[PDB]
Design a binder for this molecule. Structure first.
Ligand SMILES: O=c1ccn([C@@H]2O[C@H](COP(=O)(O)O)[C@@H](O)[C@H]2O)c(=O)[nH]1
Ligand SMILES: O=c1ccn([C@@H]2O[C@H](COP(=O)(O)O)[C@@H](O)[C@H]2O)c(=O)[nH]1
Ligand SMILES: [Fe+3]
Ligand SMILES: [Fe+3]
Ligand SMILES: [Fe+3]
Ligand SMILES: [Fe+3]
Lengths: 193, 193
């Protein structure tokens, strides 16, 4: 059960999350919970760790800059992190908030949440499941999501590569800064294409 | 004169380069020589250093992997460099070949050639002139070159930003690895957009 990892039932979690998140963001999280379960089953990952990580991955989405900045100091994280924003922080720093609120201590789940936005050059199968599930969950409809879904039906590594390539391309297209760990992920996975 | 920097006249250089390079690549280099002069004049860079760096920037374009690998060892460069290829090497390693053949010792010219493909987070005005001149030289016709030309007519920094953004976008589009120093350049310059 979820209580094996956090300090409340799935039902009570959803109630807590309904406070913290707009509906669309909660619906998304429920989408990722389902998508992560299906991927985990296909690629030999613990379906329960995947489901929970997937539901939790955007938990800290709506924390404010101030809190993140507080969390960076409190936990004495990489000081470079202050140079970035919500996109980077919600996973990379947001894990500390999850840990505070829900008493989550499982290292594999925490890591999968941590790098769900930017990945890493080395990713566990659980990390990849969350990273991909986030992208392909049934509520998303961005052009090319169908291709991501097909790829993910066949290869977890190739789905990581495709998603990462598309994010880097889109961020450069938009003129947005790109977190250097994202490029670590890109270069590590791009051969899979 | 060019002989103030290298060990032969411009004429004798062009003869040497005509041996080393296909016509199209030499025509390109002549294009960059002209474009660098015009940019240098507009943005207060030594027109002669710019012209020479521009003519020389793709000198080592057609060295083979073997030679580059030789040069990496000989000059005890970053060992990580062996993991890459011609795109990265021709400027970053190719400067050592230029130095061998032409007795080029000027640090500013050497640096501008060194990073002409990937840039750096910190670039001198001369570095930027070569980086941009390479992209906008009159022989190039890629779609959007007109926009690069307009931008470069107004702002060197913004032209660096535009070029870098487009390269990162294109490489991700193509599924090609991206040299991490390229992202250093991207993140350093992207605000200028
Ligand atoms: O290095 C990165 C990677 C992703 N994003 C952006 O941050 C958002 C949050 O990503 P995700 O957590 O929805 O995957 C995405 O929309 C993506 O465009 C960045 O700003 N930098
Ligand atoms: O980090 C980079 C930057 C550029 N290139 C590619 O290498 C080529 C050489 O660049 P340039 O020296 O013509 O600018 C370009 O066509 C570009 O697509 C890379 O492979 N990696
Ligand atoms: Fe997220
Ligand atoms: Fe998400
Ligand atoms: Fe070049
Ligand atoms: Fe060139």
């Amino acid at each position: 059960s979820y209580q094996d990892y956090i300090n409340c039932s799935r039902e009570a979690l959803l109630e807590k999350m309904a406070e913290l998140l707009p509906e669309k963001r909660l619906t998304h999280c429920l989408g990722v919970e389902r998508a992560a379960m299906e991927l985990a089953q296909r690629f030999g990952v613990d379906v329960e760790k995947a489901s929970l990580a997937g539901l939790l991955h955007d938990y800290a989405k709506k924390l404010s800059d101030q809190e993140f900045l507080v969390l960076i100091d409190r936990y004495q994280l990489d000081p470079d992190l202050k140079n970035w924003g919500n996109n980077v922080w919600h996973g990379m720093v947001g894990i500390y908030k999850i840990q505070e609120d829900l008493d989550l201590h499982d290292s594999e789940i925490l890591r999968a949440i941590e790098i769900h936005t930017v990945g890493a050059g080395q990713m566990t199968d659980l990390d990849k499941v969350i990273y991909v599930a986030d992208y392909i969950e049934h509520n998303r409809a961005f052009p090319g999501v169908d291709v991501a879904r097909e790829i993910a039906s066949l290869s977890l590594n190739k789905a990581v590569a495709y998603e990462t390539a598309r994010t880097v391309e889109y961020l450069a297209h938009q003129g947005f800064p790109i977190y250097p760990q994202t490029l670590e992920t890109y270069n590590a996975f791009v051969h899979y294409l």
